[PDB]
Design a binder for this molecule. Structure first.
Ligand code: POV
Ligand code: PTY
Ligand code: PTY
Ligand code: ATP
Ligand SMILES: *[C@@H]1O[C@H](CO)[C@@H](O[C@@H]2O[C@H](CO)[C@@H](O)[C@H](O)[C@H]2NC(C)=O)[C@H](O)[C@H]1NC(C)=O
Ligand code: K
Lengths: 205, 335, 61
């Protein structure tokens, strides 16, 4: 006997009735984006840019502001808060159930660390002059957003009560992810793959 | 409160500061350039991080691939050994847990392949992800192998070790003044095609408006064939006489105590074992220019064989010298 | 073959001619961007022209 991400109950993995209309498969799918973002954003930040182009004395905190930076910090702090709430609800529910049922909160924890890594990646890639990499981040959000949606709609088909704690708590994540996606899009113009001026201006200490 | 800005600190490393630069960017090809050159402490981590990441990622992919095909249901729930006979419909034989998928990804990528977890012919997506995982594994393997060989190629070169004396001198040789430092070498291999150049850095206005702020003249080093080369095994003394053409010709004994001079010295050449060019540079502000002091004999013929005694590399002894100017000394005989 | 990036020696857009140290002088500006230094450097300036010879041969370039 050990961890059972789908509940240690037979037929809890019986996918005969429908392909994605399962309580745990949706959770695992939602988990996947974090276990992709961490493993595509750990070493890139680890092996920083160390090549020599012009000099070593760069303007400290050169581009202190970034396009749309005002929302980012507060929005991601709210994302951390809602992840905390989700993990709390799961963990409090856990003690009533029989088996471990890691599907309750493992995605929440993985998303917590993923969001913290996202904040670190944003700050370490924006302050230094390297926005061509930032495009990668955008992909994550899209992926993550889709999975989050893939959850919520199904719940409506199951019609969980609006007054229930879990459904209400999990609802806001989709909107938070959408706002974050819009924030990432709005700074899409200066640095992107093509057809942009991509104007270069240095900023004063 | 700061002292006059120095062009080159004692450890080379020209400390200029270029600003107003047309900052291109990074191009994402800088990351690989940095990665090929790291201190060995890191390249035993990025190796482990890359391998372990790729393994775990493909393990989760196998887990979901098996999970969505209903295999895990057939293994876990249906009869353990006797009550159930496999329908052969499974996607990846005998992987009924996540740890099983981990021990399958290790097999499928490190080319171990124990054979207790075969690949059947049912699930096309499984074959697709097998092709993709194998390709990714080979690409990562080749990149890491090339990185390790590159960082084994650079095990010969360590650091430039060519030692100039602390402070220079100015003395009398053959009835004429001079200006001497002391170069030297440490490691076993000699230098090949070694060359020496002496530049004096100054702020020299011109009678026609132009005022070059930091301008660098070149001055010859003493040699009986007018060749800037030098062949050194024991420390030499690269003198450079002063004459009307030379810029130090107007230096003075007292004015040098408050004067704007900057005699940088650069030395180039290759090393036989490495076969790589190299150079070393230093500078001598007025504060560390003595006067009258001459360098000390260092080589003494012992009973058996010659000995160079580093114990007194930069020691100097006072000796006769006039306090007049170069132009004073060369002005007239009686002068 | 990844150590290389590209050329990094920069010239002035325009020349200059003036009087220095009493006589006419031709100028040009040279600068560098790469942090690593450039050892054993050398420069050469050449005039390219269509010429004439008393014997008659003409070299176009
Ligand atoms: C530390 C004690 C054992 C240490 C072994 C290492 C593996 C630990 C994870 C683990 O227990 O697997 C668990 C999941 O686990 C997960 O769901 C992890 C989430 C995905 C991994 C992403 C990177 C982290 C087991 O998941 P499962 O195999 O689907 O459970 C059904 C299999 N069974 C029916 C036999 C129970
Ligand atoms: C392990 C450590 C890995 C560190 C990252 C290495 C990235 C190397 C990228 C090299 C490169 O410049 O190619 C780019 C492709 O990036 C890539 O394809 C990245 C693949 C890296 C796999 C390792 C762009 O290529 P380009 O823009 O010059 O070509 C366009 C012609 N259409
Ligand atoms: C592990 C498998 C070992 C297989 C053989 C590897 C030999 C080559 C390792 C290079 C080496 O000498 O290790 C140095 C220190 O190692 C260490 O400090 C080891 C740390 C753990 C010791 C216990 C790192 O090289 P470096 O950073 O000191 O050299 C760069 C500055 N020139
Ligand atoms: N601040 C700078 N940083 C990097 N490179 C520069 C800078 N200024 C000029 N250059 C380079 O010097 C060359 C000629 O520059 P120039 O003196 O003509 O300035 P400019 O008139 O602004 O140049 P351009 O017209 O190309 O913008 C150009 O090829 C350019 O790449
Ligand atoms: C988990 O295993 C239990 C074992 O009792 C299953 O029990 C279900 O309980 C409801 C309550 O009415 C009934 O439908 C049956 O007693 C069981 N449901 C069936 C056979 O469909 C339970 O099915 C398992 N969990 C889930 C989500 O199916
Ligand atoms: K093998």
């Amino acid at each position: 006997m050990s961890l059972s991400f789908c509940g240690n109950n037979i037929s809890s993995y019986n996918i005969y009735h429908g392909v994605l209309q399962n309580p745990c498969f949706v959770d695992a799918l939602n988990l996947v984006p974090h276990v992709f973002l961490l493993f595509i954003t750990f070493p890139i930040l680890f092996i920083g840019w160390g090549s020599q182009s012009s000099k070593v004395q760069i303007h400290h905190n050169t581009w202190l502001h970034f396009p749309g930076h005002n929302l980012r910090w507060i929005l991601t702090f709210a994302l951390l808060f809602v992840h905390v709430c989700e993990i709390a609800e799961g963990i409090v529910s856990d003690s009533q159930r029989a088996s471990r049922h890691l599907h309750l909160f493992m995605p929440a924890v993985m998303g917590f660390v993923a969001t913290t890594t996202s904040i670190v990646y944003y700050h370490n890639i924006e302050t230094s002059n390297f926005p061509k990499l930032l495009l990668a981040l955008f992909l994550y959000w899209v992926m993550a957003f889709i999975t989050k949606t893939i959850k919520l709609v199904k719940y409506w088909q199951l019609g969980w009560g609006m007054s229930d704690l879990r459904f209400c708590i999990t609802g806001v994540m989709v909107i938070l992810n959408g706002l974050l996606m819009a924030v990432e899009i709005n700074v899409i113009r200066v640095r992107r793959y093509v057809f942009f001026m991509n104007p270069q201006k240095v900023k004063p200490p | 409160r700061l002292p006059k800005a120095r062009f080159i600190a004692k450890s080379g490393a020209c400390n200029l500061a270029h600003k107003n630069i047309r900052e291109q960017g990074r191009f994402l090809q800088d990351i690989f350039t940095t990665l090929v050159d790291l201190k060995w402490r890191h390249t035993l981590v990025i190796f482990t991080m890359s391998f372990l990441c790729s393994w775990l990622l493909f393990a989760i992919m196998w887990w979901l691939v098996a999970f969505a095909h209903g295999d895990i249901y057939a293994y876990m729930e249906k009869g353990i050994t006797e009550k159930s006979g496999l329908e052969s419909a499974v996607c990846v034989t005998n992987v009924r847990s996540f740890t099983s998928a981990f021990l399958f990804s290790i097999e499928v990528q490190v080319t171990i392949g124990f054979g207790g977890r075969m690949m059947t012919e049912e699930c096309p997506l499984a074959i697709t992800v097998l092709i993709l995982q194998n390709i990714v594994g080979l690409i990562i393997n080749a990149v890491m192998l090339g990185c390790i060989f590159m960082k084994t190629a650079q095990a010969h070169r360590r650091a430039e070790t060519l030692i100039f004396s602390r402070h220079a001198v100015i003395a009398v040789r053959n009835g004429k003044l001079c200006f001497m430092f002391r170069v030297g070498d440490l490691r076993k291999s000699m230098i090949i095609s070694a060359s020496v150049r002496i530049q004096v850095v100054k702020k020299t206005t011109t009678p026609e408006g132009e005022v070059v702020p930091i301008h660098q003249q070149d001055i010859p080093v003493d040699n009986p064939i007018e060749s800037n080369n030098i062949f050194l095994v024991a420390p030499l003394i690269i003198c450079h006489v002063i004459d009307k053409r030379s810029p130090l010709y107007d230096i003075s004994a007292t004015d040098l105590v408050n004067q704007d001079l900057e005699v940088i010295v650069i030395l180039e050449g290759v090393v036989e074992t490495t076969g790589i060019t190299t150079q070393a540079r230093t500078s001598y502000i007025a504060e560390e220019i003595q006067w009258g002091h001459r360098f000390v004999s260092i080589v003494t013929e012992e009973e058996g064989v010659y000995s160079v005694d580093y114990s007194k590399f930069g020691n100097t002894v006072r000796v006769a010298a006039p306090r007049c100017s170069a132009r004073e000394l060369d002005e007239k005989p009686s002068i």
